[PDB]
Chain length 168, copies 2
Amino acid sequence: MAPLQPGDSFPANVVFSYIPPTGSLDLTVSGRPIEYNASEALAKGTSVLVAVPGAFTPTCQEKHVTGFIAKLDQLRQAGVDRVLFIASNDAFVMSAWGKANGIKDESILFLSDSDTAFSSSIGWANAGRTGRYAIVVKDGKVVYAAVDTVRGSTEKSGVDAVLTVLGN
Amino acid sequence: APLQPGDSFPANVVFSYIPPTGSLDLTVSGRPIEYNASEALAKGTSVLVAVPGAFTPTCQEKHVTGFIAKLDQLRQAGVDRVLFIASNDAFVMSAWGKANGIKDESILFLSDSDTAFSSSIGWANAGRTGRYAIVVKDGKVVYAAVDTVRGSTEKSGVDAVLTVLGN
């Protein structure tokens, strides 16, 4: 299928699995997963959805999520209402990944694209992992969608690319 | 082939893992290598525990924590190495070990990539390993058992392993 383009509607009926943040960073509490209605959340306001190949893996952790965390204030000033990080890791691993990064609240949500269903549906999954990509949505419409295919690069899906889009 | 007491531990069993560096900081990822489990298990007393998933409720809150709480007793019972495996990748397994305060070789946290080993002994399910424990002495299986009851560590928990070792 053709990748998402600016002006496309964000796909309907997209649901992720996640553990909402409790405020505790205690990694030894597994938590309770529920679902997240991504299509509904993205229908209003400005959203940034970032997919990473794997929680805790080197680029995803040391460059990609850390870049977003470092510029959360700039994202908020740019009008972003929600930031979602997804991967194929299960909700328990994703919750731990957020806690390991000090995220106690909803500033970034960490969710599972179970079995890569959503990422596969938009052509950006590989053998059980999602690609590395970012989608910016406003009021249910794609503003930007791009995937990084160069190993270790966040040129297209990193926080700076997203901030550039929002400033234009 | 279901492993049972008296069998040789299978050959060519290799896991993927990040050897512990001493770090307890989950934000540093590490470099994975392979672990030759068949060779490590050929000498001494080994406990190999498989869990369905790093960070999941029973695996975290009951199974690995039970083993950590009684590492002193496992040592005194003659255990030379404890290995925890799951289908999660080596980066997740390393983070899971660090989340439990393990910074050395007291318990190693390794990936059974694609459930290769667990499938070969009949104890894997839909991309996850089963919950099981294998005790090995000098290359020979002395105990091998799987828990199939949801939330149970009756057969693969530390108390079952300590009982095995005491008999």
